[PDB]
Amino acid sequence: MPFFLKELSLTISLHPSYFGPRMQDYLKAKLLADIDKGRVVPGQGFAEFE
Amino acid sequence: TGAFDIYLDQDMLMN
Amino acid sequence: GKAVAKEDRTTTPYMTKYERARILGTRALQISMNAPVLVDLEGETDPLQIAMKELAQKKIPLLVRRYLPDGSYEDWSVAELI
Amino acid sequence: EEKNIVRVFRAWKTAHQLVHDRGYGVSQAELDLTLDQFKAMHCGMGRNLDRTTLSFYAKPSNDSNKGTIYIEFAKEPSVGIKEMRTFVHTLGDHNHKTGILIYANSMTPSAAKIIATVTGQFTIETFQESDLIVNITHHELVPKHILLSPDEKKELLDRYKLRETQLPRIQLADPVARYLGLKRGEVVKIVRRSETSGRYNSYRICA
Amino acid sequence: LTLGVPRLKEILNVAKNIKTPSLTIYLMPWIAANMDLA
Amino acid sequence: MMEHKIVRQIEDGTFERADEWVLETDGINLTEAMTVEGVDATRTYSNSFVEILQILGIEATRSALLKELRNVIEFDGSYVNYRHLALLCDVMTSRGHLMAITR
Amino acid sequence: GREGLIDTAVKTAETGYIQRRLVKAMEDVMVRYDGTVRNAMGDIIQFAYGEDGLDATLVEYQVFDSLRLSTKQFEKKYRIDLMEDRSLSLYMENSIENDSSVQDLLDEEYTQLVADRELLCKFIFPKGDARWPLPVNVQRIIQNALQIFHLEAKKPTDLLPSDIINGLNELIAKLTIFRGSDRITRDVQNNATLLFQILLRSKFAV
DNA sequence: AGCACAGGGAAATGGTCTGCTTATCGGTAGAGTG
């Protein structure tokens, strides 16, 4: 039973409504269900986290 | 106006 | 791209007019989409005015990632910018 | 007759100034001569210009790494392959690293091929007499060109995080580039006046 | 619409041949101060 | 033969407007024109940029471009800031030769 | 009148094409965050926009007073000789007659002023033109100061020469366009603010 | 046997600027001769 421990990346988009102190708890749960600086997408307002 | 990128500072969002 | 240290930053310490326009527009757009407001409201209804009054108090939680021509960049807080 | 003598004197003094500018040694007596002194020192009894004595040479002043420079005025009005081979032989005989050949009317293309043929051994630069009658670097429009050493070029590039291709360019065939003997890759710092800032420093890479 | 738009067009395209080629030859200070030597 | 107004610094430090005789030609031959005895070879100027570039180099070419652009623009009495003309000249001379503003 | 109409109808198209060509050639040239002007390929077009790094909107014409003054008048307006001159203390709340260190400061000041005048008259504006667009209308700021503080021409001032020298030097040190501890950054900063420094030193001589 | 009407139909001759394609032509270079 070969199990591999690997480092992976994902790009999470977050709504401005969540931009508060609990931002990072929300991202971790979303990552588990499915942290870099948040890039605010021009013209949309979301924040991209790697 | 697009010669730079905007990011969130979470250090401030904590406080 | 390599991030420059806070002490090594060589760009201007002032907010450029383009930076000010972009910051106000981005914060106003985020407020219009129900982003929590980090300033006391006296009945303002326009998100742009709310962002302006946040800026006056340096309460906009945003950074500016200024890119140098070679690709290295400096992150400046909207609060620390003059 | 006299016109040719004065023209060659002007070109010869300009060549001396050119040598002094590149960093080679030229005695102030050589720089500050006069037409009559040139006539005495280079013309025979009949005043016929003797093109054999028009050649001279100079040593580096502050950079011993540079080799000796040799300057010769073509005896024949038009330089050919024969004279090009003769000049290369003269350069090799005395171990002159740099050599400038000044001709009067024209130079053949197959003769020019010899310059590329021996580029790895000697650096040969060709001038026409008319190109040296007047020193262009003394013109008002020409700002102050200064060759930068490799250390200073590296400093500039690193400070601006530049690549050599991203600097402003100066052509190898540029009159001032030929006057200064610029090779490809060398950067010149050009100091200029400025209506706005008073003084300005531009930097041009030879390309 | 040499001066004006035609001259600007000549400058901008780097015309190898221009309508009015000219030189401004400045004489030496002692020559330039006398009409006969000029 | 024309009489041009030149400005020169008197020995006492002030500037005076004197008169100097200048020769304005038709047709350009700059390199031979400078070599003529009696002409100030340090001031001879031509209104052709290719000629200056082949004779005097690229920095002199940029200066000549600027002078002729300003002559064209300011003849009417108007004025453009030096920055715009200088940027146009630097773009047209950046790569070592005259880049024509054309296809 | 027919010729005028024809000229209009042709010149419109001529200039339209010229402007499109001009914009297409320089559309990509932009000021970067290190002060340099570069095109989309990163090629440096200028090392400082306008050679001084200033917005053309904010500049105003200023007159260089020291340029057209004679050497005698320049000395009269700028040379201070406490050994021979005593009228300075008549204008001051504090006596500085026959003071050595103050005279040394004044001598350094005047040497710098003479160097600046030499550079102006010989290198920058040999034609003797004095009115040039510079940042900040310093004369207007001086007039504003005279009006705001009700400066009485008959009231002796509490300003010492050292105060003026130190203040002007600190101001000049605070006119930062380029930032960096390197050598060529210092050189480019000095070059960029050179003309403004000359004007400031000519305006705020002791 | 002459026209609808979709199938089968193309023909009498009536500004300067750059880069390619050709003629031109030196300057040597063989030696062919002596």
XYZ file of C-alpha atoms (C1' of nucleotides) in Angstrom:
735
model
C 0.000 0.000 0.000
C 2.224 2.843 -1.260
C 1.256 6.112 0.441
C 2.986 9.313 -0.677
C 3.505 12.463 1.400
C 3.475 15.352 -1.077
C 3.256 19.141 -0.973
C 0.437 20.542 -3.111
C -0.938 23.980 -3.946
C -4.389 25.417 -4.602
C -5.715 28.850 -5.581
C -8.618 29.893 -3.343
C -10.894 32.791 -4.288
C -12.519 34.527 -1.318
C -15.473 36.906 -1.261
C -14.982 40.377 0.275
C -17.689 39.616 2.839
C -15.288 37.164 4.509
C -12.438 39.698 4.764
C -12.177 39.735 8.548
C -10.230 38.185 11.423
C -11.624 34.702 10.691
C -10.439 34.778 7.069
C -7.791 32.096 7.590
C -10.078 29.629 9.373
C -12.468 29.863 6.419
C -9.705 29.188 3.886
C -8.417 26.125 5.743
C -11.892 24.593 5.981
C -12.495 25.297 2.291
C -9.154 23.673 1.466
C -10.054 20.640 3.579
C -13.551 20.482 2.085
C -12.187 20.816 -1.457
C -1.454 30.511 3.097
C -0.080 33.134 0.717
C -0.931 36.825 0.563
C -4.322 37.568 -0.946
C -4.183 39.076 -4.430
C -7.192 41.334 -5.005
C -8.484 40.472 -8.487
C -8.965 43.652 -10.563
C -12.560 44.326 -11.542
C -14.000 41.645 -9.238
C -12.850 42.302 -5.662
C -12.123 38.698 -4.710
C -8.774 37.734 -3.188
C -6.665 34.908 -4.625
C -4.771 32.851 -2.037
C -2.205 30.265 -3.109
C -3.536 52.817 -12.480
C -2.648 49.191 -13.264
C 1.123 49.578 -12.890
C 0.959 47.704 -9.568
C -0.993 45.020 -7.734
C -3.255 45.296 -4.691
C -3.112 42.732 -1.884
C -4.816 42.304 1.472
C -2.823 42.907 4.652
C -4.178 40.341 7.102
C -2.074 41.771 9.933
C -4.442 44.743 9.821
C -7.572 42.611 9.426
C -6.714 40.883 12.712
C -6.604 44.278 14.415
C 10.225 37.443 -8.279
C 12.006 38.226 -5.016
C 10.385 40.304 -2.285
C 12.533 43.205 -1.091
C 13.099 43.621 2.638
C 11.220 46.379 4.439
C 14.500 48.127 5.279
C 15.886 47.846 1.733
C 12.861 49.445 0.052
C 13.912 52.206 -2.340
C 10.600 53.349 -3.843
C 8.866 56.551 -2.831
C 7.244 56.546 0.638
C 4.262 58.543 -0.670
C 1.049 57.204 -2.159
C 0.997 57.924 -5.880
C -2.128 59.413 -7.419
C -2.599 56.233 -9.443
C -2.125 54.202 -6.263
C -4.669 56.377 -4.465
C -7.226 55.972 -7.256
C -6.699 52.204 -7.418
C -6.832 51.793 -3.634
C -10.009 53.835 -3.277
C -11.683 52.016 -6.155
C -10.725 48.572 -4.872
C -11.809 49.295 -1.299
C -15.082 50.838 -2.493
C -15.744 47.788 -4.657
C -15.065 45.479 -1.711
C -17.356 47.530 0.546
C -20.139 47.434 -2.041
C -19.845 43.635 -1.834
C -20.411 43.663 1.946
C -16.809 43.797 3.133
C -16.705 44.731 6.840
C -16.116 48.450 7.307
C -13.144 49.348 9.518
C -14.402 52.844 10.405
C -17.397 54.348 12.171
C -20.178 55.330 9.773
C -22.161 58.559 10.196
C -24.886 57.483 7.773
C -22.869 57.404 4.553
C -24.448 55.340 1.775
C -21.914 55.622 -1.064
C -19.184 52.942 -0.835
C -16.694 55.359 -2.392
C -17.237 57.923 0.375
C -16.896 55.161 2.967
C -13.584 54.154 1.393
C -12.456 57.793 1.348
C -13.161 58.195 5.061
C -11.405 54.889 5.736
C -8.401 56.244 3.837
C -8.373 59.490 5.815
C -7.973 57.358 8.957
C -5.590 54.938 7.196
C -8.053 52.111 7.893
C -7.972 50.479 4.436
C -6.586 46.917 4.829
C -4.727 46.807 1.519
C -1.164 46.563 0.254
C 0.510 47.877 -2.881
C 2.908 45.438 -4.551
C 5.132 47.844 -6.465
C 7.087 45.952 -9.121
C 10.578 46.966 -10.140
C 11.463 46.580 -13.830
C 13.548 43.459 -13.139
C 10.640 41.728 -11.362
C 11.563 42.335 -7.729
C 8.766 43.956 -5.754
C 8.073 45.904 -2.574
C 4.917 45.601 -0.467
C 3.722 48.893 1.026
C 0.837 49.145 3.469
C -1.835 51.717 2.675
C -1.461 52.788 6.309
C 2.288 53.448 6.180
C 2.116 55.241 2.824
C 2.180 59.021 3.143
C 50.309 72.014 -52.708
C 50.201 74.114 -49.547
C 46.576 73.065 -49.070
C 47.515 69.389 -48.825
C 50.266 70.229 -46.329
C 47.926 72.191 -44.068
C 45.264 69.475 -44.321
C 47.723 66.758 -43.315
C 48.984 68.939 -40.457
C 45.434 69.394 -39.169
C 44.746 65.666 -39.440
C 48.032 64.860 -37.696
C 47.310 67.191 -34.773
C 43.798 65.749 -34.534
C 45.261 62.240 -34.408
C 47.564 63.338 -31.591
C 44.580 64.732 -29.680
C 42.711 61.487 -30.370
C 45.583 59.462 -28.906
C 45.794 61.695 -25.845
C 42.046 61.371 -25.258
C 42.065 57.561 -25.312
C 44.522 57.491 -22.394
C 47.845 57.140 -24.234
C 50.893 59.306 -23.671
C 51.451 62.318 -25.925
C 53.898 65.003 -24.841
C 52.415 68.480 -24.498
C 54.967 69.655 -27.065
C 53.374 67.325 -29.620
C 49.879 68.594 -28.812
C 50.831 72.289 -28.919
C 52.797 72.460 -32.166
C 52.262 74.793 -35.125
C 51.946 74.425 -38.890
C 55.464 75.763 -39.447
C 56.939 73.255 -36.996
C 55.160 70.441 -38.837
C 56.529 71.740 -42.146
C 60.049 71.850 -40.717
C 59.787 68.386 -39.156
C 58.039 66.568 -42.037
C 58.739 68.436 -45.307
C 61.922 68.177 -47.346
C 63.956 70.939 -48.932
C 61.482 71.198 -51.806
C 58.585 71.334 -49.303
C 57.216 68.069 -50.722
C 55.442 66.275 -47.888
C 57.310 63.086 -46.963
C 54.636 60.526 -46.108
C 57.220 58.127 -44.654
C 57.663 60.295 -41.539
C 53.940 60.819 -40.845
C 53.721 57.723 -38.616
C 54.117 57.783 -34.838
C 53.139 55.749 -31.782
C 52.189 56.172 -28.139
C 52.235 54.264 -24.843
C 49.387 53.917 -22.320
C 49.452 56.509 -19.553
C 47.540 54.995 -16.619
C 46.586 51.471 -17.811
C 49.691 49.362 -18.410
C 47.425 46.508 -19.543
C 46.774 48.349 -22.806
C 49.313 47.697 -25.522
C 51.202 50.323 -27.461
C 49.273 52.194 -30.161
C 50.707 52.779 -33.637
C 49.390 55.365 -36.113
C 50.405 55.495 -39.772
C 49.251 57.670 -42.658
C 48.888 55.740 -45.901
C 51.634 56.612 -48.371
C 49.447 55.890 -51.388
C 46.306 58.062 -51.650
C 44.124 54.929 -51.767
C 44.930 51.985 -49.505
C 44.934 48.512 -51.020
C 45.462 44.945 -49.887
C 49.226 45.261 -50.378
C 49.444 48.223 -48.005
C 47.077 46.540 -45.536
C 49.366 43.508 -45.355
C 52.356 45.837 -45.008
C 50.672 47.651 -42.114
C 49.803 44.389 -40.364
C 53.433 43.323 -40.770
C 54.609 46.610 -39.254
C 52.243 46.138 -36.313
C 53.501 42.605 -35.733
C 57.170 43.559 -35.971
C 57.155 46.006 -33.044
C 54.432 44.227 -31.025
C 51.952 47.102 -31.329
C 48.593 45.955 -29.967
C 46.542 48.798 -31.494
C 46.981 50.250 -34.961
C 45.294 53.156 -36.755
C 45.717 53.535 -40.519
C 44.771 56.926 -41.975
C 44.113 57.022 -45.721
C 43.261 59.878 -48.071
C 40.725 58.856 -50.730
C 39.391 55.303 -50.444
C 39.991 51.790 -49.154
C 39.153 48.523 -50.885
C 36.740 45.959 -49.409
C 39.019 42.927 -49.637
C 41.572 45.079 -47.817
C 38.955 45.627 -45.111
C 38.556 41.847 -44.887
C 42.123 41.697 -43.555
C 41.022 43.698 -40.501
C 38.610 40.921 -39.544
C 41.243 38.360 -40.545
C 43.696 39.575 -37.885
C 41.169 40.881 -35.341
C 42.194 38.185 -32.857
C 45.843 39.307 -32.918
C 45.741 43.069 -33.582
C 43.003 45.702 -33.434
C 43.140 47.840 -36.590
C 41.086 51.012 -37.049
C 40.835 52.973 -40.290
C 40.272 56.702 -40.748
C 39.917 58.978 -43.738
C 41.899 62.206 -43.714
C 38.689 64.238 -43.922
C 37.387 62.419 -40.832
C 40.296 63.867 -38.818
C 40.750 67.387 -40.226
C 38.321 68.692 -37.590
C 38.089 67.204 -34.103
C 34.376 66.547 -33.642
C 34.645 66.076 -29.874
C 35.495 69.793 -29.715
C 32.099 70.643 -31.222
C 29.525 72.381 -29.042
C 26.809 69.828 -29.846
C 28.994 66.877 -28.811
C 28.648 66.262 -25.042
C 31.403 64.761 -22.907
C 31.824 61.050 -23.676
C 33.804 59.077 -21.079
C 34.662 55.400 -21.429
C 33.654 53.388 -18.362
C 35.890 50.670 -16.977
C 34.404 47.166 -16.664
C 33.953 47.649 -12.917
C 31.977 50.861 -13.437
C 29.875 49.273 -16.184
C 29.117 46.364 -13.858
C 28.200 48.817 -11.098
C 25.795 50.682 -13.384
C 24.140 47.515 -14.684
C 23.768 46.014 -11.206
C 22.364 49.243 -9.771
C 19.705 49.400 -12.478
C 19.381 45.580 -12.555
C 19.865 45.912 -16.305
C 20.902 43.714 -19.187
C 23.379 45.082 -21.707
C 20.633 45.082 -24.343
C 18.449 47.345 -22.172
C 20.833 50.316 -22.208
C 20.684 53.026 -24.863
C 22.908 52.103 -27.786
C 25.742 53.779 -29.677
C 26.801 52.467 -33.078
C 30.316 51.163 -33.610
C 30.433 53.345 -36.733
C 29.510 56.349 -34.589
C 32.047 59.157 -35.149
C 32.676 59.553 -31.417
C 32.786 55.781 -30.929
C 35.506 55.597 -33.586
C 37.278 58.610 -32.081
C 37.357 56.903 -28.675
C 38.074 53.445 -30.083
C 34.989 51.850 -28.562
C 34.507 48.117 -29.030
C 31.291 46.143 -28.681
C 30.157 45.854 -25.076
C 31.893 48.992 -23.809
C 29.719 51.624 -22.133
C 30.245 55.382 -22.435
C 29.014 57.785 -19.768
C 27.902 60.955 -21.546
C 27.714 64.160 -19.508
C 25.358 66.787 -20.924
C 23.875 70.110 -19.964
C 20.166 70.174 -19.179
C 17.591 72.959 -19.153
C 15.724 71.094 -16.413
C 18.270 69.493 -14.066
C 21.325 71.520 -15.079
C 23.430 68.412 -15.684
C 22.532 64.943 -16.941
C 24.375 61.621 -17.184
C 23.312 59.266 -19.963
C 24.880 55.864 -20.585
C 25.251 54.257 -24.010
C 26.565 50.771 -24.684
C 28.498 50.178 -27.889
C 26.399 47.918 -30.097
C 0.420 74.021 -43.545
C 10.481 74.980 -44.403
C 8.131 75.423 -41.449
C 4.944 73.982 -40.016
C 3.307 70.629 -40.736
C 5.587 69.899 -43.732
C 8.715 70.445 -41.627
C 7.293 68.374 -38.768
C 6.558 65.581 -41.242
C 10.130 65.815 -42.536
C 11.536 65.598 -39.003
C 9.292 62.741 -37.892
C 9.914 60.436 -40.863
C 13.659 61.183 -40.842
C 13.579 62.260 -44.479
C 16.971 61.603 -46.054
C 16.184 64.315 -48.633
C 14.564 67.486 -47.298
C 13.155 70.435 -49.212
C 15.584 73.076 -47.886
C 18.990 71.680 -46.910
C 21.107 74.345 -45.247
C 24.147 75.039 -43.091
C 24.750 77.654 -40.404
C 28.483 78.305 -40.687
C 29.776 80.399 -37.786
C 33.011 82.260 -38.449
C 35.878 82.996 -36.098
C 35.393 85.852 -33.614
C 37.705 88.222 -35.497
C 36.281 87.206 -38.881
C 32.675 87.303 -37.661
C 33.138 90.901 -36.472
C 34.161 92.167 -39.936
C 32.279 92.212 -43.235
C 35.317 91.866 -45.516
C 36.689 88.678 -43.964
C 33.149 87.291 -43.884
C 25.815 86.499 -45.365
C 23.541 87.388 -42.452
C 23.999 89.354 -39.237
C 22.868 87.228 -36.287
C 22.361 88.407 -32.708
C 24.687 86.543 -30.343
C 24.907 86.858 -26.558
C 28.379 86.893 -25.016
C 29.718 87.309 -21.483
C 31.689 90.542 -21.065
C 34.880 90.476 -18.999
C 32.961 92.026 -16.073
C 30.575 89.046 -15.894
C 27.534 90.550 -17.623
C 25.920 89.368 -20.862
C 25.768 91.603 -23.939
C 23.937 91.225 -27.247
C 26.522 91.602 -30.006
C 26.293 91.116 -33.774
C 28.104 88.338 -35.638
C 28.311 87.547 -39.340
C 27.090 84.031 -40.146
C 26.869 82.151 -43.442
C 23.571 80.438 -44.265
C 23.964 78.049 -47.184
C 21.779 76.165 -49.640
C 22.662 72.498 -49.853
C 24.616 70.724 -47.114
C 28.207 69.521 -47.094
C 29.103 69.693 -43.415
C 32.414 67.844 -43.173
C 34.099 69.874 -45.923
C 32.341 73.061 -44.798
C 33.909 72.823 -41.335
C 37.437 72.301 -42.695
C 37.366 75.609 -44.600
C 39.797 78.068 -43.044
C 38.091 80.815 -41.060
C 34.925 78.925 -40.080
C 34.304 78.077 -36.430
C 34.472 74.295 -36.711
C 33.155 74.046 -33.135
C 29.859 75.773 -34.004
C 29.046 74.800 -37.603
C 25.479 73.498 -37.742
C 23.241 71.908 -40.367
C 19.482 71.367 -40.315
C 19.890 67.732 -41.445
C 19.892 65.072 -38.732
C 21.354 62.266 -40.846
C 24.328 64.473 -41.717
C 24.926 65.372 -38.064
C 24.564 61.708 -37.111
C 27.138 60.559 -39.652
C 29.501 63.452 -38.836
C 28.988 64.356 -35.174
C 27.383 61.272 -33.605
C 24.164 60.356 -31.866
C 24.169 62.757 -28.899
C 24.702 65.706 -31.225
C 21.920 64.179 -33.318
C 19.589 64.199 -30.311
C 20.429 67.839 -29.627
C 19.794 68.730 -33.279
C 16.475 66.862 -33.251
C 15.450 68.806 -30.165
C 16.455 72.147 -31.669
C 14.556 71.543 -34.906
C 11.467 70.209 -33.126
C 11.430 73.321 -30.948
C 11.938 75.530 -34.004
C 8.928 73.906 -35.682
C 6.677 74.016 -32.620
C 7.558 77.442 -31.206
C 7.523 79.384 -34.487
C 3.805 80.126 -34.074
C 4.479 81.504 -30.591
C 3.326 78.368 -28.770
C 5.347 76.458 -26.180
C 5.645 72.782 -25.264
C 7.372 71.589 -22.114
C 10.925 70.365 -22.626
C 10.056 66.931 -21.243
C 7.866 65.914 -24.172
C 10.315 66.979 -26.881
C 13.199 65.397 -24.973
C 11.292 62.124 -24.610
C 10.472 62.097 -28.324
C 14.133 62.681 -29.177
C 15.312 60.005 -26.736
C 12.853 57.489 -28.176
C 14.003 58.361 -31.697
C 17.690 58.028 -30.713
C 17.591 55.289 -28.063
C 18.869 52.458 -30.271
C 21.851 54.363 -31.709
C 20.352 55.576 -34.995
C 17.458 57.772 -36.076
C 14.257 55.736 -35.732
C 11.815 57.309 -38.173
C 8.271 57.698 -36.833
C 6.715 55.582 -39.577
C 5.882 51.972 -40.351
C -10.576 82.594 -48.565
C -10.755 79.546 -50.815
C -7.086 78.887 -50.127
C -7.754 79.141 -46.401
C -10.582 76.611 -46.613
C -8.462 74.186 -48.648
C -5.597 74.512 -46.177
C -7.939 73.663 -43.313
C -9.416 70.637 -45.080
C -5.956 69.218 -45.854
C -4.152 70.123 -42.625
C -6.781 68.316 -40.557
C -5.953 64.958 -42.164
C -2.209 65.617 -42.216
C -2.081 66.280 -38.487
C -4.431 63.412 -37.654
C -2.074 60.948 -39.298
C 0.936 62.604 -37.646
C -0.620 62.276 -34.194
C -1.573 58.630 -34.693
C 2.003 57.868 -35.741
C 3.401 59.761 -32.749
C 1.186 57.978 -30.234
C 1.950 54.555 -31.686
C 5.706 55.155 -31.356
C 5.647 56.148 -27.663
C 2.523 54.488 -26.250
C 4.552 51.967 -24.236
C 6.982 54.445 -22.628
C 6.176 54.764 -18.922
C 7.838 55.969 -15.727
C 8.891 53.061 -13.511
C 9.119 52.796 -9.737
C 12.914 53.200 -9.780
C 12.578 56.624 -11.418
C 13.690 55.510 -14.878
C 11.684 55.876 -18.079
C 11.486 52.588 -19.979
C 9.444 51.052 -22.776
C 7.556 47.755 -22.720
C 10.765 45.818 -23.455
C 12.484 47.269 -20.383
C 14.875 49.310 -22.515
C 15.835 52.499 -20.691
C 14.718 55.548 -22.659
C 15.693 58.044 -19.954
C 17.348 57.524 -16.586
C 15.131 60.249 -15.092
C 11.939 61.582 -16.639
C 12.678 64.970 -18.134
C 16.230 64.580 -16.756
C 14.925 65.856 -13.390
C 12.061 63.471 -12.600
C 9.318 66.082 -12.240
C 5.729 66.230 -13.427
C 5.387 68.877 -16.125
C 2.081 69.971 -14.586
C 3.654 71.313 -11.391
C 6.584 73.364 -12.762
C 6.585 77.166 -12.968
C 8.951 79.705 -14.484
C 11.580 81.031 -12.074
C 14.236 83.687 -12.668
C 17.897 83.072 -11.829
C 18.986 86.329 -10.220
C 22.720 85.594 -10.078
C 23.012 84.784 -13.792
C 22.806 88.299 -15.241
C 24.398 90.139 -12.306
C 27.898 91.458 -12.876
C 30.770 90.283 -10.701
C 30.645 93.577 -8.796
C 26.879 93.330 -8.312
C 27.138 89.623 -7.504
C 29.672 90.426 -4.778
C 27.526 93.275 -3.464
C 24.424 91.086 -3.282
C 26.113 87.933 -1.922
C 29.559 88.705 -0.434
C 29.624 89.301 3.331
C 32.862 90.683 4.798
C 32.428 91.103 8.552
C 35.929 92.590 8.794
C 34.984 95.441 6.431
C 31.173 95.253 6.638
C 29.295 96.197 9.808
C 25.826 96.856 8.363
C 24.891 93.193 8.854
C 24.577 93.603 12.626
C 22.353 96.643 12.037
C 19.811 94.183 10.572
C 20.195 91.573 13.325
C 19.229 91.145 16.965
C 22.657 89.586 17.623
C 26.054 91.132 16.929
C 28.402 89.124 14.710
C 31.038 91.778 14.021
C 34.561 90.383 13.600
C 33.435 86.809 14.299
C 35.750 84.127 12.939
C 33.585 81.001 12.671
C 30.659 82.933 11.200
C 33.023 84.455 8.642
C 34.256 80.952 7.791
C 30.679 79.807 7.196
C 30.043 82.872 5.043
C 33.206 82.161 3.049
C 32.125 78.570 2.389
C 28.698 79.881 1.375
C 30.189 82.395 -1.041
C 32.557 79.822 -2.532
C 29.592 77.555 -3.253
C 27.655 80.505 -4.694
C 30.542 81.442 -6.990
C 30.854 77.829 -8.115
C 27.130 77.768 -8.900
C 27.365 81.008 -10.873
C 30.329 79.625 -12.818
C 28.420 76.439 -13.628
C 25.368 78.423 -14.747
C 27.228 80.972 -16.864
C 29.613 78.478 -18.484
C 27.939 75.051 -18.622
C 24.153 75.408 -18.360
C 22.956 78.753 -19.770
C 25.926 80.271 -21.618
C 23.482 82.371 -23.658
C 22.481 84.167 -20.454
C 18.832 83.104 -20.256
C 17.536 83.353 -16.690
C 13.822 82.413 -16.764
C 13.269 78.646 -16.732
C 10.498 76.336 -15.467
C 11.534 74.751 -12.163
C 9.610 72.991 -9.402
C 8.152 75.171 -6.673
C 7.614 78.912 -7.116
C 10.137 79.969 -4.492
C 9.570 83.689 -5.025
C 5.842 83.203 -4.455
C 6.535 81.249 -1.264
C 8.791 84.071 -0.065
C 6.045 86.614 -0.790
C 3.582 84.399 1.085
C 5.965 84.337 4.052
C 6.375 88.118 3.980
C 2.603 88.607 3.953
C 1.680 85.868 6.442
C 4.156 86.882 9.149
C 3.707 90.653 8.700
C 7.457 91.006 8.307
C 8.398 94.560 9.221
C 11.419 95.685 7.220
C 12.466 97.766 10.250
C 12.482 94.873 12.756
C 15.870 93.203 13.349
C 15.757 89.457 12.766
C 16.675 86.714 15.223
C 18.100 84.544 12.428
C 21.793 83.728 12.690
C 23.858 82.943 9.573
C 24.401 79.391 10.813
C 20.640 78.937 11.132
C 20.184 79.888 7.477
C 23.037 77.692 6.237
C 21.948 74.647 8.236
C 18.303 75.076 7.252
C 19.015 75.425 3.546
C 21.417 72.472 3.610
C 18.857 70.287 5.383
C 16.156 71.339 2.918
C 18.422 70.468 -0.013
C 19.077 67.132 1.681
C 15.305 66.540 1.876
C 14.596 67.013 -1.869
C 14.786 63.288 -2.560
C 13.873 62.030 -6.029
C 16.076 58.917 -6.047
C 16.699 56.805 -2.952
C 19.722 54.616 -2.300
C 23.085 54.522 -0.534
C 25.089 53.756 -3.691
C 27.433 56.184 -5.444
C 25.631 56.656 -8.755
C 22.317 57.099 -6.945
C 23.941 60.008 -5.108
C 25.307 61.318 -8.407
C 21.926 61.142 -10.150
C 20.155 62.751 -7.186
C 22.662 65.606 -7.210
C 22.336 66.061 -10.971
C 18.533 65.953 -10.868
C 18.270 68.615 -8.167
C 21.336 70.626 -9.254
C 19.510 73.510 -10.946
C 16.931 73.731 -8.162
C 19.743 73.771 -5.596
C 21.426 76.612 -7.480
C 18.188 78.601 -7.472
C 17.631 77.870 -3.775
C 21.142 78.976 -2.829
C 20.789 82.165 -4.874
C 17.399 82.929 -3.299
C 18.278 82.103 0.326
C 21.744 83.606 0.594
C 22.379 84.920 4.095
C -41.967 24.796 -80.810
C -41.100 28.703 -77.800
C -40.532 30.029 -72.760
C -40.221 28.851 -67.615
C -36.681 28.116 -64.589
C -33.511 25.701 -62.397
C -29.158 23.927 -64.310
C -25.035 25.390 -66.388
C -22.425 29.613 -67.157
C -16.301 34.153 -66.705
C -15.919 37.087 -71.465
C -15.278 40.829 -77.313
C -10.997 43.960 -75.987
C -10.543 48.766 -73.509
C 3.461 60.952 -52.383
C 8.534 59.408 -50.595
C 10.076 54.795 -48.826
C 12.020 49.855 -48.872
C 13.437 45.424 -50.966
C 14.079 42.726 -55.049
C 16.289 41.865 -59.446
C 20.289 43.316 -63.283
C 23.667 45.548 -65.372
C 27.841 47.379 -64.461
C 32.623 47.251 -63.269
C 36.982 47.779 -60.481
C 40.821 45.353 -57.756
C 43.153 41.930 -57.419
C 44.252 37.088 -58.630
C 45.465 33.680 -61.368
C 48.927 32.876 -64.055
C 50.103 32.501 -69.771
C 53.210 34.859 -71.911
C 57.814 36.675 -71.991
